[PDB]
Amino acid sequence: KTVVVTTILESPYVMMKKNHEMLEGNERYEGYCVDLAAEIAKHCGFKYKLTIVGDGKYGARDADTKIWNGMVGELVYGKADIAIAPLTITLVREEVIDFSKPFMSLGISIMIKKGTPIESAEDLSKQTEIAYGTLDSGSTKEFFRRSKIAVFDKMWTYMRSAEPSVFVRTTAEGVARVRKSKGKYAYLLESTMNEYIEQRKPCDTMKVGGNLDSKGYGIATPKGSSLGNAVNLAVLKLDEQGLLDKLKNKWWYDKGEC
């Protein structure tokens, strides 16, 4: 009957419509992932309910209890049937849930306040005037923590014990710190979010340098789910038709402010 979809609020993937208080159910939300969910549902022929993950996390396994949290945990423990969000495809997550082909490509990137004399990862790792950090949890932080590359190992060694903490807890926090640090803070985040903010007033940030890696976001389903196959074929079809690009351009540029 009704497929239970777990997601999370993160602009411009899933946001509350300005008039949401007057709306109900699925109609309350808007965004790239909201449009994507509708497309996938239409293609696979299923009815569904969008729900916001309880703990507001993406997916990580606690080191003490070995229990998965976030949307990944909702799928592993049978709370939701599918997760449609900017959920990064990682080896650790791939071990416990299934991912469709990526619906969007991305790579860890650098966000600076316009005017900052930083152009790449090497630049940051060499100086100390301009501080830099990542989210206090998530795929990006983990990338630096386990990296074997000298430059990235150098950046992690710094970020690891920098004071005050160069880590932020949300994308908005990371952005504000950049906008408010007078060019003394660089925020390491996923290129997709970076490109998005760049099109947001007061248009004072920008992405610099190439991406530190290459990955993608995928629609996740619990392992053995008889939904996984259909969802993957739907993603492939929407991508072949150019709809995913059109969708990205819609929420990133057509609705841009800069």
Tell me if 10 contacts ligand KAI by CB under 6 A: yes
Q: Are 98 and 226 in contact (CB under 8 A)?
A: no
Q: Give, as ranges, the residues between 17 and 76 that touch ligand KAI (CB under 6 A).
A: 58
Tell me if 109 contacts ligand KAI by CB under 6 A: no
Q: Are 247 and 40 in contact (CB under 8 A)?
A: no
Tell me if 7 contacts ligand KAI by CB under 6 A: no
Strands (E), the chain: 2-7, 15-16, 29-30, 47-52, 82-83, 97-99, 104-106, 108-113, 131-133, 185-190, 205-208, 215-217, 220-222
Give the separation between CA 221 and CA 180, rounded to whole angstroms: 39
Phi, psi of 129 (to 5 degrees): -65, -50
Q: Are 47 and 40 in contact (CB under 8 A)?
A: no
Give CA 87 to chain center in angstroms: 6
Tell me if 189 contacts ligand KAI by CB under 6 A: yes
Rounded least distance, CB 82 to ligand KAI, Å: 16
Rounded least distance, CB 152 to ligand KAI, Å: 14
> Looking at 12, 102, 133, 138, which residue binds ligand KAI (CB under 6 A)?
138
Which residue numbers in the chain precede an interruption (C–N > 2.5 Å)? none
Confirm whether residue 86 is marked as ligand binding.
Answer: yes
Tell me if 118 contacts ligand KAI by CB under 6 A: no
Tell me if 218 contacts ligand KAI by CB under 6 A: no
HSE-up (13 A, CA, CB side) for residue 229? 2
> Looking at 36, 87, 178, 231, which residue binds ligand KAI (CB under 6 A)?
87
Tell me if 171 contacts ligand KAI by CB under 6 A: yes
Rounded least distance, CB 198 to ligand KAI, Å: 16
Largest CA distance in the chain: 57
Tell me if 194 contacts ligand KAI by CB under 6 A: no
User: Total number of residues binding ligand KAI (CB under 6 A)?
Assistant: 12
Question: Binding site for L-glutamate: which residues?
Answer: 86, 88, 93, 139-140, 190
Chain residues binding ligand KAI by CB under 6 A are: 10, 58, 86-88, 135, 138-140, 171, 189-190
